[PDB]
Amino acid sequence: NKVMCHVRRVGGAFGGKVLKTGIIAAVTAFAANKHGRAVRCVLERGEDML
Amino acid sequence: HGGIEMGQGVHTKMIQVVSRELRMPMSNVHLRGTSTETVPNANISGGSVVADLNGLAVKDACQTLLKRLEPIISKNPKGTWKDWAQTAFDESINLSAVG
Amino acid sequence: ELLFYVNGRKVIEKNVDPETMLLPYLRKKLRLTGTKYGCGGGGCGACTVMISRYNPITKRIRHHPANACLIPICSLYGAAVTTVEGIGSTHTRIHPVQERIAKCHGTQCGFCTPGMVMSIYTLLRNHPEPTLDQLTDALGGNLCRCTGYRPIIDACKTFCKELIFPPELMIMAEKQSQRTRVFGSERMMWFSPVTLKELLEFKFKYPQAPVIMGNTSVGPEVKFKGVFHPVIISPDRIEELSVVNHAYNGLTLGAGLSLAQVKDILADVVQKLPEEKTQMYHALLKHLGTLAGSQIRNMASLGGHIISRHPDSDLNPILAVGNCTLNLLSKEGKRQIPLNEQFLSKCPNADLKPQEILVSVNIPYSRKWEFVSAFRQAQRQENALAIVNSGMRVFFGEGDGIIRELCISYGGVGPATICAKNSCQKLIGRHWNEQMLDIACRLILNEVSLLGSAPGGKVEFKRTLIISFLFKFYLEVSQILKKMDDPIGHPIMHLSGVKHATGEAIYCDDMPLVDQELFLTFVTSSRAHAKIVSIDLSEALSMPGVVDIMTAEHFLATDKVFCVGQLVCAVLADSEVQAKRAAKRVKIVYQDLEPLILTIEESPERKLEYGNVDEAFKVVDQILEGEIHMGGQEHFYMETQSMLVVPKGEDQEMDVYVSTQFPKYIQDIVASTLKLPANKVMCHVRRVGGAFGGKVLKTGIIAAVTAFAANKHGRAVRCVLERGEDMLITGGRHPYLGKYKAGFMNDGRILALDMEHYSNAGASLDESLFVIEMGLLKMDNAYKFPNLRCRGWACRTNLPSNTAFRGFGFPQAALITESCITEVAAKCGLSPEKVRIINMYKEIDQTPYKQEINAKNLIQCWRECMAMSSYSLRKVAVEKFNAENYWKKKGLAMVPLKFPVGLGSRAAGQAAALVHIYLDGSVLVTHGGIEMGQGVHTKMIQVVSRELRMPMSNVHLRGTSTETVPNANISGGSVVADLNGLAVKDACQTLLKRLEPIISKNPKGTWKDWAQTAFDESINLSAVGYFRGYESDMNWEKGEGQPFEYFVYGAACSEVEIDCLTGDHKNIRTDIVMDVGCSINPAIDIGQIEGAFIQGMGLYTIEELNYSPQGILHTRGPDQYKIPAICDMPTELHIALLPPSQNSNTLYSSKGLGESGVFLGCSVFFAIHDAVSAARQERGLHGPLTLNSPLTPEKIRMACEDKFTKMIPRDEPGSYVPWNV
Amino acid sequence: EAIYCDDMPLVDQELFLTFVTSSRAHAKIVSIDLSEALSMPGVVDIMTAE
């Protein structure tokens, strides 16, 4: 009841944005909790495909 | 609703559903975006069912409102939605529906 | 370079602007936001911060509190700054002070607790095992509009029987090179000498630069007055400026020594040497223990006070009579001048040069057969600037009565400290008897020749206080001469009480900045009925920040201004300080109009009827004609009007984060202003800092123009106001003019009553008549009147429009009826107690608006308070005390109370809610009621925890919105707790209805299992709750209906003690009982009761609104607004809560307080009334008395007529147009 | 004008996260170092399970 997710829109996700977005978000939230400031994460195309 | 817009055009579907069922034009309805503070425990947007699933949920919420607006429109032939909404405000008719 | 420490981290500033203060720097830059902007002028005490400074000589560090809202940045080089966030936190170990101030329920709104916990922490650091006297001394400066201070002293009562200074600071103090620092800016230059010589040099340079040492007297001038100093000077730790010396000429104190150090040195020195040598030290200590507060006493020093030339100075007249000489020093040598009238009159011959810093001051030993005394009178006991103060000493010598030395000086009377010379020139020679007092009075009465143009008003009051102080002097010297010859029903700590006491609570301004923000500020009219012909804005446009100066030409003043404080233009700027500076120099052309209306008596009907008054008046024994005036009030909510408006850039969406009470109005007005459907504009609140009303209409129009600006220019816009224009924009209570003609039989019972209520509305032509309706009903609390004819009218004035308040109309009409009752009881000959008993409601009766009431509760609390407070013994002791004392009259009073709870129409009571349960055991609840200090959310958590059996941990609330719960109501009327709680009840009942099988199949598990299974079997877990509200009907054409859901019943007895010479009063003991039922949370109930009582006592005794004859209200000065402080509490307040009654339609058999105990504050009021009567009982005069409200010490002293008032020069009425109407 | 997740404005004092992947399918990790990495200008912290 503390964590609120917000999704206004998504730019064309033709399936499969679930487990890996979760594994990104888990450590992003770990970092944001330990160092009390917002953390923004964006992935490169090669990082995606890998 | 609890379904994600990912370019397939689900929010236009939802605005069309609300426009048809509540008998108001397209222009008179708004939609912001998915969140887990308003619609909890929604399911994954995968299977091609989420559009129809949330369309049925939106239909359900709209029906629950329109049954409460039954007497007001019963007692007024030509009402803009402002007139019925303010009236339903006066007779203490709820206007927040979970579908 | 600027180098200091905040909470233990080193902070470096370069290339600064020294024209910026500390508190905006801690908020907008370093972002330790647990420190609050209360007033910016030193009054509030909200911004308390600990400052520690190390002395490289003494090898020790001195800790002192200070108000960060006046402290400049450039005075902190090498000092440790400690805020609320450095002592403990919700992650680390919490310090025992915050733990005990939250455990003892010392928090209600939380916008006052960080300063107070830092004050208690500072005193515990300085003092390990203190006394309650020291603790109360420490907390004197701090204010609280909500609590009433009792739990704070309760938490302090257990103390009576670690942070470390950074080593970098102490080592660079041990080095301490001779570094003279310069802080430069484009506007204002700052110089700081570490050595004496450079200070003397820079003073010998351009001398228009003030020697800033405490900022306490220059800060207000640069702020409200607006004067600007191009260059300023400010010393460092210079030893010569701060040294204590004992010599045959008494002692020598440095000008750099702060008043707190001075007080400690005097307090220790008066315990060493015999009292035959010390008389002026005791006077200085007497006026030092009563100076503003520990913060200001540790910020302000001797020299600044001496040279400030403030007429209200509390220490100057003691010095101006005690043979004191200021030592000086400059490039052209040394000097030693005396302090007398010539020093304070501003004449050039005796004074300081444009050079010669004041170095020190010497106070001699008092000679034997010489006695010194000083007296003062102000609106409040503590932290109030005096209206008349005096310094008095007389030296005889050789054991006789002949006057050879007699020095008396008066401050606060004229434009400066006036000292009597010619009367002092003539009094010499006679004995210490009555005749010299006659001579002194007959001289000083017309020697200090005041006029009708005396600023601050209270002409005859000061004139009487003069001789009153002289008379006190006479008695005290004569005396010494004669001598030497289900969590419901259990007390549960607030949800965010720790989060208050540890400074994690976010407010509408504590939230961060968003990209490309702006800021907005208004310009307000200062004329009452003045036509606008032109506005000058050429020079306002061109300065850094100004985007567009918005006017009425594109909701603001168009052609004429009908009230002061009306909005005519607003300014758009890139930052706050730029916005204020740009606003302060827009020029408006005016032409004043002839018909000027400011008062009720020179400016539709609402009438209730019961029986026929005419026949009883033809029959009844005695006819009374009486009248009363009751003045208004100001809310003084601690948090000011803060808001932010954010455009979205897509779909014209507009977020509005505003700390209001009524988001529906905000959304509606923004939608109508932007020409948008309401589905685009959303509104957000999380908590509001202690708002008691008034944050409704003016907040609406402020949000309207803020949103207009945020839309048209396509950028975010923040808008926060300040305390002064908060008073100037927003009105307060309606002041009432009440006439009455009553009829009562010799049985002392009222059988005839006519009322003509009049209200002072404001400039608005279409306004809120409703209180005139509403307050018409609630006129009589507990007294049965067989006949009523009660009418009301609303009178427009050229003034800001008035709004609602806590209590809301009941206090006014209730005290009008109470005063009519009391004057009847005086005209009869029987005690007001008997008159109230044989006029009080029966067990069962019927209100004049035709509604059944059952009131054995009122009679039972009457008996309980009467018998368990020992009424008879205490009262007979009161008459015994008045029979053996002549100037000390103590008065005891008792007052009942019936308060109706109910609303107007059908739409008013409806309340919605939204409840989610996620797939664990954890619940998210939201509603439409606003959190503003009552503790509504703790009650909601208790409700949800009883209705779902899970422990209190599992539930969390995340603020309110209009996107989750739409179309909520006003968060007022003391019902929104009940209404939104019923909505929460409905939602939780729906959820527990949805889950019979899962729960009843699973006996010994958790909510985790049952919510999991509920999702498994496809059962909804989020529901809307809703409550239709109580049915209320009122008809005015017949004056009948059922408009009130229920009534609360209480009683309060109060004991006071007034002094006939100086017209102030004490509060000794108040015993208060009320009937509430099975309380949801007893601690919250007792807190609300105490807070309402304190607010009512403050309205009835202290608070006054002085208006200039052109309509301009006064915010600071002699007539500044006061609110009750920590010393205004009764010594004992024994409050007990009676057993319940199990009522019908009240949530969980609990009653809705929050506006009820306000009128019980009239108790002490009538108590002083009683005392005044005893005075006129012994003075032998029974002449007509007209005691209005508030009973300021002025009117209390006027009521105690004496020979002193019989020798006061009566100024002609139509001579001058005085300070106040 | 369609606002996406990256099109939100910058929030105050937000950090930035970037991932360091793997390069060998089946392998054993012997030792990890960050001394040149953590001493870069701008780095706040490196999160590893080591």
Ligand SMILES: Cc1cc2nc3c(=O)[nH]c(=O)nc-3n(C[C@H](O)[C@H](O)[C@H](O)COP(=O)(O)OP(=O)(O)OC[C@H]3O[C@@H](n4cnc5c(N)ncnc54)[C@H](O)[C@@H]3O)c2cc1C
């Ligand atoms: C909210 C509030 C409440 C107050 N309550 C009280 C009260 O109850 N009782 C009371 O007696 N007073 C009261 N005061 C007044 C206060 O005590 C004085 O203003 C204060 O002592 C001035 O000291 P300062 O160093 O802060 O003055 P500063 O602002 O530092 O001094 C400004 C002026 O003093 C001159 N100056 C200062 N020091 C020197 C020096 N050494 N040599 C030459 N010139 C010098 C500067 O040139 C300048 O003209 C109150 C003030 C405020 C704002």
Ligand SMILES: Nc1nc2c(c(=O)[nH]1)N[C@H]1C(S)=C(S)[C@@H](COP(=O)(O)O)O[C@H]1N2
């Ligand atoms: N333009 C667009 N079309 C799309 C997708 C998308 O991301 N963008 N996702 C596809 C996938 S994987 C699914 S399952 C469906 C989901 O749409 P619905 O569940 O709302 O029918 O859209 C399909 N078509």
Ligand SMILES: Nc1nc2c(c(=O)[nH]1)N[C@H]1C(S)=C(S)[C@@H](COP(=O)(O)O)O[C@H]1N2
């Ligand atoms: N601490 C605190 N108590 C307060 C207030 C406040 O701002 N702070 N407002 C008062 C006012 S004006 C009202 S109407 C009631 C409303 O709260 P309730 O509905 O929970 O009684 O709270 C009262 N008590």
Ligand code: MOS
């Ligand atoms: O079913 Mo597709 O949205 S992974």
Ligand code: MOS
């Ligand atoms: O909160 Mo209400 O008394 S305007």
Ligand code: FES
């Ligand atoms: S005491 Fe600092 S803002 Fe009022």
Ligand code: FES
């Ligand atoms: S609780 Fe102290 S100011 Fe409100």
